[PDB]
């Protein structure tokens, strides 16, 4: 029970699992989960298991400044904020006075799914996809709203040799697990390589503190304008003719956040809160190099966590490893019930949602999976330097408790027990679903994925912006299939999804996931 690092936790409780109850550390006797307690493990060469300012007893016991999320309660997942900026409107004016103004919508994870390449059938134990480019939440991509495709140059009489101005509306949000005080975004604007003008904001004019979850401006409120800014008061961003005629094509404008600074909260003996001597400036550059990154994108909200893991090649560090399933169980509020992880009600699983990987970590995890005999990627060792994106289906049925398809699927029978996850379907005849434009976002990209087994040829038929029908012969075990398509505008016809089997096949865990947006 000797203490090596000064944190007042016995070392036997840190090698084993321990929980904090009665504001003290007791060993995990594997009978406190039904109470509602959870288990932590702390490293002993350093009193801070993760590199956050808060210490292992304070972090693992809930002694922090209360404003952070509840998912940073473990001493393994740190709490630092990841701000983000988006645009919700565009104004183009020539006065230093014609004006054209439209609406824009932002997606946090759109460039991360921009370069991912899909394959029909995954011919390994990988059963996933690898993207070429990994983008965080802090950068984001925008789409202008409906305008019937009319040219932007017919509303402004601007020729070669003249410059228009940017006016817009912006919103600040957080997706991490921390509020950051004295908000100084210092964001930037890029337009396919060349930047137009960086955006510099001050502490008091925008919101001083910016808590996670909620936004500045709040949900369902007017976004903050660029005219009401001391820098952009007598001048705005100028544009030449070539740039606007390039934006006449199917192109988009993107935002990033470059560098921020500010203080953090702490406690006091005489007072209670002071945020002057604190800073995040010298703590981010430790967290960014020790841990591994997870990003999730539900269709309404994105989350990210940063979970620590050991390097394989060095005996000298005693930071305990994790597997991928336990890492997403601890990082997220993932309840593991019947062996399956659920965030709130959306299932999260290798067999239920889409997982997207970068290029470097894919090689290492494919090397590790050959050692693994389970051939499932939730049990491989999480190491330092992992970057994983996970995307939720808009619609995903598993012929089970989770069903969200907006139209009923024709010829579906779930009277079987040999499905991969609970019951499955039988393609005795053929399954079909009509899904119109009003239930879908316009001018997008999608992939349709699922698990099949055949203990025969199966034809898929997708009515889309381009009709696509295809064949696939299934295996006796489960092989994941996926098919890419794109849709067209709202006033068009529908999406008809048709699957004709051979009578003796089983299909389970069928999903539709958003990938990209088609240009115009």
């Amino acid at each position: 029970d000797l203490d090596t690092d000064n944190d007042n936790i016995p070392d036997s409780y840190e090698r084993n699992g321990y929980t904090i109850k009665d504001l003290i550390a007791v060993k995990w006797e594997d009978s406190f989960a039904e109470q509602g307690y959870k288990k932590y493990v702390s490293n002993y060469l350093e009193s801070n298991t993760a590199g956050d300012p808060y210490t292992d007893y304070e972090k693992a016991s809930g002694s922090f400044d209360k404003a952070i999320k509840t998912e940073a309660r473990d001493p393994l997942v740190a709490a630092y904020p990841i701000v983000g900026v988006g645009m919700e409107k565009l104004i183009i004016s020539t006065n230093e006075g014609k004006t054209v103004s439209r609406a824009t919508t932002n997606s946090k994870t759109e460039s991360n799914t921009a370069g991912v390449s899909v394959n029909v059938g995954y011919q390994n134990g990988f059963t996933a996809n690898v993207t070429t480019n990994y983008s965080h939440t802090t950068d984001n991509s925008t789409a202008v709203q409906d305008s019937n495709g009319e040219s932007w140059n017919t509303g402004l009489s601007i020729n070669k040799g003249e410059s228009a101005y940017i006016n817009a509306n912006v919103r600040y949000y957080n997706t991490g697990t921390a509020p950051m005080y004295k908000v100084t975004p210092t964001t930037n604007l890029v337009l396919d390589g060349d930047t137009l003008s960086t955006i510099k904001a001050q502490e008091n004019q925008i919101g001083n503190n910016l808590s996670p979850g909620d936004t500045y401006p709040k949900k369902g409120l007017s976004p903050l304008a660029l005219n009401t800014m001391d820098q952009f008061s007598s001048r705005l961003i100028p544009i030449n003719y070539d740039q606007l005629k390039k934006l006449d094509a199917g192109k988009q404008i993107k935002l990033e956040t470059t560098q921020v600074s500010g203080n953090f909260g702490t406690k006091n003996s005489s007072g209670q809160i002071v945020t002057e001597g604190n800073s995040w400036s010298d703590y981010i550059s430790q967290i960014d190099s020790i841990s591994a990154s997870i990003i999730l994108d539900t269709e309404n909200e994105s989350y990210e966590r940063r979970v620590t893991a050991k390097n394989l090649q060095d005996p000298e560090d005693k930071t305990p490893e994790l597997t991928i399933g336990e890492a997403i169980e601890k990082a997220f509020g993932a309840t593991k019930k019947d062996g399956l992880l659920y965030f709130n009600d959306i299932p999260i699983d290798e067999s239920c949602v889409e997982l997207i990987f970068d290029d470097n970590t894919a090689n290492k995890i494919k090397d590790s999976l050959k050692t693994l005999s389970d051939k499932k990627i939730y049990n491989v060792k999480l190491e330092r330097g992992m970057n994983i994106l996970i995307k939720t289906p808009t619609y995903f049925t598993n012929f089970d408790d989770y069903n969200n398809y907006p139209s009923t699927w024709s010829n579906v029978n779930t009277t079987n027990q040999d499905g991969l996850q609970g019951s499955a379907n039988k393609l005795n005849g053929e399954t079909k679903i009509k899904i119109p434009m009003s239930e879908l976002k316009p001018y997008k990209r999608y992939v349709f994925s699922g698990y099949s087994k055949d203990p025969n040829s199966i034809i898929v038929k997708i009515k889309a912006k381009e009709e696509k029908t295809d064949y696939l012969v299934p295996e006796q075990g489960y092989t994941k299939f996926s098919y890419e398509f794109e849709t067209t505008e709202k006033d068009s016809s529908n999406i008809e999804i048709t699957l004709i089997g051979s009578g003796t096949t089983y299909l389970d865990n069928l999903s539709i996931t958003e990938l990209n947006s088609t240009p115009e």
């Binding site: 029970d1 007042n8 504001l23 003290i24 550390a25 007893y57 003996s269 005489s270």
Partner: protein
């Protein structure tokens, strides 16, 4: 902390040269000067006059007497259970839990008693938390009264509060608080003051003479004649008769009338205050001899056996008790290794004996026979190479 530091440099600009030199002398030698201030009064007058620490001790005591507080202050400090006659460890440093049964033992040990606090002691003004030193599981949180000594002083990067505790304490309550997951005992006690003189013997003589100059006129001639007998040699015969179980084994009605006259004379003028006196007791007063191996306190086991036998007990003297206001060592009983410290409640019988002219008694006071003392504490020190004991006891009626 901020307030403490603020009147630390507010005090520091009014200090003198010898006072500040004694202040850094204590800054470098805190523990030894504190233990010296605990037990210096049981030495000789010339031992104190030739002691090296006495000039710094009196300069610091002058500084503490100069700095008085305007309001009662709740203060905090850490100290061993052995200080409060709990001669054992409540919880160790590797232990974090003070159980309910050992808290009950501490309750049933420290209750309903007055415990001495003497010498210089550091304390803290606000409740210690995580960033402070917590050496012991025992934190006392005391209401210091008005005008008590108060020295906030900045030592290097820290600040500390030094006082001259010169009072007993009554422990009103103890509660079981938790700091950094470790159980601590937080003691809410009361400062209870008694009149003590120690080495200040001339002023105590003046007080006893002022309180007892007309006492001889108020006694009967039988009482006055028996008092004159007692101060002229009758103390030997009277005390010998009383220890020998006089009225039972060998009844002497003349000596019964004599001791009744002395008892009524002591009942004539009860004392107007709570007092603290000292007595150079022999081993024969404690069931021991000079040849007793237990009398040699130079080994620790004799000290511990004496503490086990005598602390927390009621001791009865069936004879009249002759003590004095002085705590100093004398040539008459420097041989004796027992120094008894007695706290007398107000209104108890007794008189100051050295107000009568023609008596060779040195600042002596007398107590009625059959008296009982509740022994509260036993401490130890080194008079020369001889280990001597300090027995803090209180007169119970």
């Amino acid at each position: 902390k901020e307030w403490e530091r603020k009147e630390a440099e507010r005090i520091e600009q009014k200090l003198e040269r010898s006072e500040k030199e004694a202040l850094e002398s204590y800054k470098k030698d805190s523990v030894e000067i504190s233990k010296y201030s605990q037990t210096r009064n049981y030495f000789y007058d010339y031992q104190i006059e030739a002691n090296s620490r006495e000039k710094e001790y009196k300069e610091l005591r002058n500084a503490i007497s100069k700095n008085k507080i305007d309001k009662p202050m709740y203060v905090y400090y850490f100290e061993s259970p052995e200080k409060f006659a709990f001669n054992k460890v409540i919880r160790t440093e590797n232990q974090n839990e003070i159980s309910l049964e050992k808290f009950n033992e501490f309750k049933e040990t420290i209750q309903n008693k007055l415990f001495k606090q003497d010498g210089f002691k550091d304390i803290s003004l606000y409740e210690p938390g995580k960033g402070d030193e917590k050496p012991t599981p025992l934190l006392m949180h005391l209401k210091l009264p008005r005008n008590t000594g108060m020295l906030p002083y900045t030592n290097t990067n820290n600040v500390s509060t030094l006082i001259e505790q010169g009072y007993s304490i009554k422990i009103d309550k103890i509660v079981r608080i938790v700091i950094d997951g470790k159980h601590y005992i937080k003691a809410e006690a009361s400062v209870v003051s008694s009149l003590d003189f120690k080495d200040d013997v001339s002023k105590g003589d003046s007080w006893g003479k002022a309180n007892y100059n007309d006492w001889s006129n108020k006694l009967t001639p039988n009482e006055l004649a028996d008092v004159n007998d007692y101060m002229r040699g009758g103390y030997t015969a009277i005390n010998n008769y009383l220890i020998s179980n006089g009225p039972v084994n060998n009844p002497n009605p003349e000596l019964d009338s004599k001791i009744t006259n002395i008892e009524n004379a002591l009942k004539r003028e009860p004392i107007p205050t709570n007092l603290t006196v000292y007595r150079r007791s022999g081993p024969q007063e404690f069931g021991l001899t000079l040849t007793s191996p237990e009398y040699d306190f130079n080994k620790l086991e004799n000290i511990d056996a004496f503490k086990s036998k005598w602390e927390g007990q009621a001791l009865s003297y069936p004879n009249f008790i002759s003590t004095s206001i002085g705590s100093v060592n004398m040539s008459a009983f420097a041989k004796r290794k027992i120094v008894l410290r007695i706290t007398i409640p107000k209104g108890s019988p007794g008189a100051y004996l050295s107000a009568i002219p023609g008596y060779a008694g040195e600042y002596e006071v007398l107590l009625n026979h059959g008296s009982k003392f509740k022994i509260n504490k036993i401490d130890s020190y080194k008079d020369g190479t001889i280990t001597k004991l300090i027995v803090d006891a209180t007169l119970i009626p």
